[PDB]
Design a protein around this ligand. Structure first.
Ligand SMILES: Cc1cc(NS(=O)(=O)c2ccccc2Cl)c2ccccc2c1Oc1ncccc1-c1ccnc(N[C@H]2CC[C@H](N)CC2)n1
Length: 403
């Protein structure tokens, strides 16, 4: 038997892509002139997979959830056909040279999270998130790729007006990626969507560390998850991009499930912002506190812990041409976060009109200008992002926060 044909699906049995659960085999094949992955399953699984297909005429209408195509029936088997993909995220992370990837890994992280937000918005908790089932599409003609969430065998649709689900026997996920509240002792709250956030948090660090895991090597990482013993070694405490990454990830993998942000909060985090959007944040913040009281709650939050962030005096930690231009105005307090943000806002606003050598020390707008400040004050953004959560409901700030 060289080519099997079951209805609209066809494949060569020799084109094995791997296996799913024990008793399944996946083949490469064709459906309506499209490339598909075809999972063959036994009778014991027939309505177990019809339950998962019912969920997938409703969930896979999202670019970052795997497309379902067809189901066909043999005398002995069922055949499930989904979109053929090029790789898994594990394969991507472990094999590719990250020197040549730029921002792509972070975009795949965005896409994954976005697929996850879609699922959660339909009352579906995935329960088995890992690099092994985050699939990377076939590239398009310009070499562009995307991540897609797959593997819905452990998915649970919460009934209408339920916000959690209870534990059952058996392995609730994959060892090394399971949120602690699924296994821990004397736990008095039910698990919920945040279990996917914990798993994603681990996945996030796995992508950006180029293969490490917050909870150690594969042998004792589940045990370390229950103990709360994590480490994010690869993130420097004084590198802006690592600090922003850390701030997000340590919350996503929080031991207390209620401290973890929802998928939509994660999508809004500065981890995902371009340099121009970061700069725009700084500006929108400065316009927002432009006429606020030194003792009002907003400016108070922004200054709490401010001096360490500003390096005690920020005027002393900038270049000589800029320090000279600002001293002259005789208005900027060097111990204040507000005033550093205001100095940034003003220099952006008046950029063309600034003396040549000030323009040259700052570099170009927007990219170099913002990096001038974030490279010198690597906690400025993370800190400003936390403090301005007081204004998260305001319309000005909905590009930056969710709710
Ligand atoms: C993870 C997963 C889960 C499945 N089940 S499911 O619960 O997600 C499901 C999804 C959508 C509708 C129904 C179901 Cl049951 C799959 C069902 C059918 C076909 C493939 C499925 C599936 O994917 C694969 N499983 C095993 C081996 C390979 C795949 C697979 C899927 C898509 N593309 C590829 N391509 C591979 C190419 C070779 C690379 N080394 C890795 C990627 N593989």
């Amino acid at each position: 038997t060289s080519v099997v044909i079951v209805g609209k699906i066809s494949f060569c049995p020799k084109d094995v892509l791997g296996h799913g659960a024990e008793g399944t085999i996946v083949y490469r094949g064709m459906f309506d002139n499209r490339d598909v992955a075809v999972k063959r399953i036994l009778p014991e699984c027939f309505s177990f997979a019809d339950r998962e297909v019912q969920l997938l005429r409703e969930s896979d209408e999202h670019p970052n959830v795997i497309r379902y195509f067809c189901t066909e029936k043999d005398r002995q088997f069922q055949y499930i056909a989904i979109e053929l993909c090029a790789a898994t995220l594990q394969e991507y992370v472990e094999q590719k040279d990250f020197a040549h990837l730029g921002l792509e890994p972070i975009t795949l992280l965005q896409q994954t999270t976005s697929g996850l937000a879609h699922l959660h918005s339909l009352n579906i908790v995935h329960r088995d998130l890992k690099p092994h089932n985050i699939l990377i599409s076939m590239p398009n003609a310009h070499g562009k790729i995307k991540a897609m969430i797959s593997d819905f065998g452990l998915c649970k649709k919460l009934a209408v007006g339920r916000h959690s689900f209870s534990r059952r026997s058996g392995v609730p996920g994959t060892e090394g990626w399971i949120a602690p509240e699924m296994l821990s002792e004397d736990c008095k709250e039910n698990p919920t969507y945040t279990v996917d956030i914990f798993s994603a948090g681990c996945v996030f660090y796995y992508v950006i560390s180029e293969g490490s895991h917050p909870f150690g090597k594969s042998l004792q990482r589940q045990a370390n998850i229950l103990l709360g013993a994590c480490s994010l070694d690869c993130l420097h405490p004084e590198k802006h991009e690592d600090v922003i990454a850390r701030e997000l990830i340590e919350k996503m993998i929080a031991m207390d499930p209620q401290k973890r942000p929802s998928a939509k909060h994660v999508l809004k985090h500065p981890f995902f912002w371009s340099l121009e959007k970061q700069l725009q944040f700084f500006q929108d913040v400065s316009d927002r506190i432009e006429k606020e009281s030194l003792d009002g709650p907003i400016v108070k939050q922004l200054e709490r812990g401010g001096r360490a962030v500003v390096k005690m005096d920020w005027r002393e930690n900038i270049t000589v041409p800029l320090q000279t231009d600002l001293r002259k105005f005789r208005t900027y307090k060097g111990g204040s976060v507000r005033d550093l943000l205001r100095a940034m806002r003003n220099k952006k606003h008046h950029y063309r009109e600034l003396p040549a050598e000030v323009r040259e020390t700052l570099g170009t707008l927007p990219d170099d200008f913002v990096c001038y400040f974030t490279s010198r004050f690597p906690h400025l953004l993370a800190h400003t992002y936390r403090a301005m959560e007081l204004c998260s409901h305001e319309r000005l700030f909905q590009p930056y926060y969710f709710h």
